[PDB]
Design a protein around this ligand. Structure first.
Ligand SMILES: NS(=O)(=O)c1ccc(CCN(Cc2ccc3ccccc3c2)C(=O)CN(CCC(=O)O)CCc2ccccc2)cc1
Ligand SMILES: [Zn+2]
Length: 257
């Protein structure tokens, strides 16, 4: 099955998922001089005050912090979006070294990691329906660079030892995702896809310009996770990122001058 190794990694995915070579694949390089300011874009509205986190899961590709999305509790609206998008989960992609790990790049720069806050358009009723629609999902992407610690990340870091291997989960209630945001909500936006199989072209990407800083100790703990299940030879969960894909006939728009 698909993964991030030499024999099952991103260059192989197209054999099982031919949309990997499609017309609106993600991630992409954000060329900051070619992205055009769109004065028509609204400010993002990130309304996470009522978020209800439930569980954290190692799924063998990353770890997901899952939320109660049975009601409009934590939602993303505004910006390029029409309607209301409910937060279902967040996860990260990261590298084996600080110089790689992000999926999007900025003028070819790779960050140490990238946070994806995944939301689905409530007009489609459930996430599985939403992923079949060109406007079904909105993923808020936030870059991580290594420097000072991010206090709001530490509760995530400290539970990772309890979910070291594929298929392990742990209770993860009362986590506030507002503690993972940078100060500014300036962003780039473009139409794209899921960055893992099935690579469905259902995502409005909203990538924040301002990275958050995390400490070396925090990211080192990400890199102690395992792709493998318990009782299997250890394969460190590192470099779980897809590289930039062709932009093709797309425009990246900036919310800011
Ligand atoms: N990096 S990213 O771009 O942000 C990014 C990349 C990938 C994803 C996830 C895609 N994903 C796999 C999937 C999704 C759809 C598929 C459709 C057909 C065939 C295979 C598929 C595989 C799921 O969410 C699986 N969920 C089950 C795992 C769980 O519940 O833990 C379905 C949840 C669900 C909810 C309601 C109805 C049905 C399903 C998100 C973000
Ligand atoms: Zn992701």
């Amino acid at each position: 099955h698909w993964g991030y190794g030499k024999h099952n990694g991103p260059e192989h995915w197209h054999k099982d998922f031919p949309i990997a070579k499609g017309e609106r694949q993600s991630p992409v390089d954000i060329d900051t001089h070619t992205a055009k300011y769109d004065p028509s874009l609204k400010p993002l509205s990130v309304s996470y005050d009522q978020a209800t986190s439930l569980r954290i899961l190692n799924n063998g590709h990353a770890f997901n912090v899952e939320f109660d999305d049975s009601q409009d509790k934590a939602v993303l609206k505004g910006g390029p979006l029409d309607g209301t998008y409910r937060l279902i989960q967040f996860h990260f992609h990261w590298g084996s070294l600080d110089g790689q790990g992000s999926e999007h790049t900025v003028d070819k720069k790779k960050y140490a990691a990238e946070l994806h806050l995944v939301h689905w358009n409530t007009k489609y009723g459930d996430f599985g329906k939403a992923v079949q629609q060109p406007d079904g999902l909105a993923v808020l992407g936030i870059f991580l660079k290594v420097g000072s610690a991010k206090p709001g990340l530490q509760k995530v870091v400290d539970v990772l030892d309890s979910i070291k291997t594929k298929g392990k989960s742990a209770d993860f209630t009362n986590f506030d995702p507002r503690g993972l945001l940078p100060e500014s909500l300036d962003y780039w936006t473009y139409p794209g896809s899921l960055t893992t199989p099935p690579l469905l072209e259902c995502v409005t990407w909203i990538v924040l310009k301002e990275p958050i800083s995390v400490s070396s100790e925090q990211v080192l703990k990400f890199r102690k996770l395992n792709f493998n299940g318990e009782g299997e030879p250890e394969e460190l969960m590192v470099d779980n990122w897809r590289p930039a894909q062709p932009l093709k006939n797309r425009q990246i728009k900036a919310s800011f001058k």
